[PDB]
Design a binder for this molecule. Sequence first.
Ligand SMILES: Nc1ncnc2c1ncn2[C@@H]1O[C@H](COP(=O)(O)OP(=O)(O)O)[C@@H](O)[C@H]1O
Ligand SMILES: [Mg+2]
Ligand SMILES: [Zn+2]
Ligand SMILES: [Zn+2]
Lengths: 48, 195, 604, 645
Amino acid sequence: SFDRPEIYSAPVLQGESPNDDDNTEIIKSFKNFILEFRLDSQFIYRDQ
Amino acid sequence: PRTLTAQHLNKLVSVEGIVTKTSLVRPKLIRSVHYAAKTGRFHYRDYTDATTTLTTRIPTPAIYPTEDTEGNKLTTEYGYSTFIDHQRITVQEMPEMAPAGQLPRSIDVILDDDLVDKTKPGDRVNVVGVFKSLGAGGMNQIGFKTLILGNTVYPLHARSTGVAARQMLTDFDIRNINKLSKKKDIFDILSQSLA
Amino acid sequence: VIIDLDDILQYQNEKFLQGTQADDLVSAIQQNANHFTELFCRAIDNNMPLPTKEIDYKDDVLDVILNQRRLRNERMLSDRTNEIRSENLNDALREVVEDETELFPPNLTRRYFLYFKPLSQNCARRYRKKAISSKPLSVRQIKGDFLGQLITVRGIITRVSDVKPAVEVIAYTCDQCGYEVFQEVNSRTFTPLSECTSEECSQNQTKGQLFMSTRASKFSAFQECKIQELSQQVPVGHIPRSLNIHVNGTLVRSLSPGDIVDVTGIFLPAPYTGFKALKAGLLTETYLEAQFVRQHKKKFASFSLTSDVEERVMELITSGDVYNRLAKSIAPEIYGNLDVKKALLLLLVGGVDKRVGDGMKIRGDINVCLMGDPGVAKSQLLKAICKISPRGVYTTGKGSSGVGLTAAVMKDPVTDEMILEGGALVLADNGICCIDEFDKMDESDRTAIHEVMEQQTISISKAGINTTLNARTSILAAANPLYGRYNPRLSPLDNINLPAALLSRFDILFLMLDIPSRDDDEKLAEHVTYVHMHNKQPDLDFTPVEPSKMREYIAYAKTKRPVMSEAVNDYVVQAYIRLRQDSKREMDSKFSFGQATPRTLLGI
Amino acid sequence: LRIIWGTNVSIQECTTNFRNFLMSFKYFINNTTDEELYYIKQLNEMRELGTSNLNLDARNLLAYKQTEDLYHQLLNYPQEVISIMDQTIKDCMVSLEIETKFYKVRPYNVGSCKGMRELNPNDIDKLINLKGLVLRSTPVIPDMKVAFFKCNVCDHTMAVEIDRGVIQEPARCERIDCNEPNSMSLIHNRCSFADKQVIKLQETPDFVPDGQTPHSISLCVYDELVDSCRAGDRIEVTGTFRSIPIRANSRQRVLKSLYKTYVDVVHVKKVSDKRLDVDTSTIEQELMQNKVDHNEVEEVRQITDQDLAKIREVAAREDLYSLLARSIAPSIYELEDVKKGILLQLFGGTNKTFTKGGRYRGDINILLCGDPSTSKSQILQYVHKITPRGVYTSGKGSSAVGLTAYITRDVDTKQLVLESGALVLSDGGVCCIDEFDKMSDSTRSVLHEVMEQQTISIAKAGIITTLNARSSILASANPIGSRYNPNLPVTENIDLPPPLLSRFDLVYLVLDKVDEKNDRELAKHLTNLYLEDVLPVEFLTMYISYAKEHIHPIITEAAKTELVRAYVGMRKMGDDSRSDEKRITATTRQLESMIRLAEAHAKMKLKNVVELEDVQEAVRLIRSAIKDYATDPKTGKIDMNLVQT
Ligand SMILES: Nc1ncnc2c1ncn2[C@@H]1O[C@H](COP(=O)(O)OP(=O)(O)O)[C@@H](O)[C@H]1O
Ligand SMILES: [Mg+2]
Ligand SMILES: [Zn+2]
Ligand SMILES: [Zn+2]
């Protein structure tokens, strides 16, 4: 009469160097774009 | 066990014989209680089987809950659940009533809860209960599964056997037993009556 | 960490004299004990002091990884706080960082164990409470009402399994991402993972392959013990029953076969393992989870001289006369026989073992044999000496024959290994063995006794066995003369069945005859009839030392090794010369059990 | 200070720390070898000899201040430390083929520890050492390293490397032209394999806690250390402590939570200072195979020339025979005649091989009859512990099956295998049978063939073959009744058929007499031991091994004359007292006994020539053992007034 076992994780090491067409790199590049891209002197998308 | 046939199924019977083997008393789970640390609430469930009600019901095969109605993980509370004990015994015809040189006949008795540890192997016994047919005898795809659901179990005493003999003493009996003592020839009267 | 509930009771009764409020924590710990392990475990992680010894090169392999992981933990929180401050999107910052990051959970950074110590009866009788926990119980009395509770048992240990690792959390390493996956196991069989379950691998189409890292995994020390009922608890006419006990952590290697113990455990269910055709409902099996072990007879090895052992061994000696005092403290209901009991005490204490050089040994433990006519209380003495010794076994002639003495080959249910099960001689190692009806044994059984008394090892060469058992045991034996009574018309060796070579190996041989004497009989009868009327011994100017206090003094005595000088050597040489000169004239006329030998000098 | 994750190791730190020690090591101290640069001689001689294995003792490092750290680190992370230690060597070697040859280290002095069963789960992946007796070993098992794949549509062949046990099978052909899904097939005999063997060891620890029955352990030896251990060998092994999960059954991929334990062996030691060296006469072809296999497991010990000079310096001594007899058992106050028999039993006779088939061996068999309460029992124990291979048996505790062979079920593979018995395990050693007179006629039957031809023939279900049992027999028997009775003949005092008594080379009657100056000396001897010249154990064993190894004695005509004369004289005696079994009748085995004892005495003192003194000493010993200098040849009685201590 026991319970449900769990699976969990945690970062340890540097894996293989990242290919630029990786999904996570795409997500990170698009997150940089959101908070970085400027037109004039106003950061349009963060404000939006 | 020899004269018990298929025309007595579904009736209350009395069976005589000798106990030949008993099984280990095991717990049976009825109600299980749980805890959710994300909501502070306790949940329960019920379980049942075919050997607890004398009439046929439509089965309900419920499952063991590990998860909440939202997905919260539940801890199992072993001390708050309810368990009821179980045992099975086999009966056979007594050696001094059975036909000589012939193989013996036996019957299975199911006992639960309070009647679970009343006898030991090698005892003369009388059992009363319902002679039940169970399951489907291969018609979903030997015959039917037959057993007795015990309600009464009486130990009996016989010559050269491990079950003792005791009688209930009436107060009238006690009065004679105590009256006899004062007379100072108790030893002689009791001694001369020995065979 | 051993939690004592007698502490919890004092704390809650302190929160009642001062008048504050509290909760009944003891009963909740008692009736649902499996949750409070984790409640306590995490409460103690929250309350933790700091380390004060910089990790060095003399520290365990486990501690290196445990220390490393906490540094790796704090590094990522600092890292992400910096990176969050970078984009400039002191309290909500913590709640953001907490959720944004992945850390090692508490379990893979602990290193301590937590057990519960039952509620003592002495403490429960002071504050007026009823201790369900320290009450012992048989094996029959434990029913389905007792599942999930904290209970104590009384029984005798029949089998103990070796120590093997039990996996609790398996560790995996992914080469594609560099994360670490931790799988939980709580069954007897599990299925290993194949693909990665990390966040990165879970997102990207390319998913790495898992490999097992043995060192990081979570392992526990596991043992399984069988416990049987005592004779005085079995009903009339029934057979004794059994039960299973589990042990984890630093509580392993504490129970050994043949011990009488009281075990504190948590009664928990397991899945059914019987026949399918005989299954009706949700049937389950039971087992016990060990937390605290008590032994009724403390072993001599454990002896460590603290200040209360000082106190009572310091009173024992202040009254002097120790030799006679503890010689008459063996079976104070048996009349007479002081010289036999003086020899018994010395067999209980022992001697000195000598590694002479070249790794050759001399035995330093004494063997005693008793002969006599019927009804002189030999068996009662054997029973008593088996009750006083920490390890000691009582056996009768023909009921213990063959593999019941030496050893047997059986397959281990738990570890699936071929083990050797010990007999009486192997259960009494570092103890006293008591054999009754010595003259009736088989020749095969007598050869083994011969070997054990000479060199303290048993050699077996049978199908499937070529080994040598290590058996350090002292022998106490009883035997009747061949014709029932002693015939002084016949020679001394004509009255004893055993060969003289066996009797030449016993250090001291006592002959207990029954010659009717009118005067002594009235003093023996007085004692016996007094005993049957009062359940105490008849002497009011003598204190019988309790068995525990005798065991303590014997252990402290056994922690000493005296040595011999030259002046004492002269005496022994001179006495041996005269004894050797005198024994020959007695053996020539056929009026001795034995001619003097070097073994008599070793016995002296 | 880069630290490898999960460890405290810095690779560069340890490599540089190790090369200074390897290029400079220090240490009743000499000035020839104890104060020279040690390890560069070891490396140079290695490369000169054409060798690949360096054997690295361990406690060397717990003194030199730098590498102390490395000792603790080596006893905790053997995997990572041993790869650092090899790169030091192949760097150090060219610093002094050596660009394509691989070097290895083998630690063999890890200490402490107290047995396998005292180890906890926190000792996994650690280095430990073991001692014990070998019982079984499975045949070689092939282990795959590189696999072979063929494309069944294009015939392009690929090779893959095992990575921590797993093989990656390509899904698509690699050819740019033929790109098919799932076209790769495995050809088993084109793959590269390696060696694996499993040994079972009976552990013999020093500390045995109360009530431990013996158990068995599993050891895995790979590559070079294959067939380096044989059943009956007492060995010392260094290795790592592992664990592994097992599958519940063949059909399912499910595993069991309780783990299984074993040891990965790195070094094996088959020598001891305190025990004798194995008989090279019985392992001739294993020596040849070891050289062909290039395994540097050393079987015999090294002899320097100072020690060999000592050997002849002592061998020149006038009282060599008394000195050797005295140093056999330096704590058993006893007649030197008894000890001399054990001394000559150890040397053994000359083994002779005919080139037309037909083998003559030189094993000596001794019986120790006599009163109880003597020191016979200690002699057997002492001889058990000085001989390299042996088993100790009781009288009424043995079966024919337990002495010859048997079939058993292996709990690992669940199949039936053959296992050795007591006498076959004692091949080239001493077997000690205690209480020989208490043994059944069925069990005594098997000893006839071992005492005649030194073989055993088994015709059982599964095996029909002849086995080699080249063992020495040392037996002790109990006299009938309380004591030896001088008034009766010897054939009436020992419960053994008179024909069996003649198969033994020496029969020792140990008699007890009451005499005041013997008793005084024995009592002083015993009491001196409970307080607080002879040859120590090491030198005795070294001398005996040297003699047993090199010299080989051959007999001359002057000895032949005396041998024939002595045999005829012995037979002519008691010619009338043959019908009545009063004395032990003389047979041809006594002639062979004289031959064997003369050869053994020649081997002692390092001669290759058996002269007349040897035969005279042999006959003297044979008569003195049976106490023929006090026996009345008509009645068979001993005058105890003439039996002097
Ligand atoms: N000296 C004695 N003192 C007290 N009780 C005795 C004495 N001698 C015999 N008995 C009693 O008589 C019985 C003798 O039984 P047992 O010990 O088996 O004797 P034995 O060993 O000689 O056969 C026991 O009940 C014992 O208590
Ligand atoms: Mg008795
Ligand atoms: Zn991954
Ligand atoms: Zn292709």
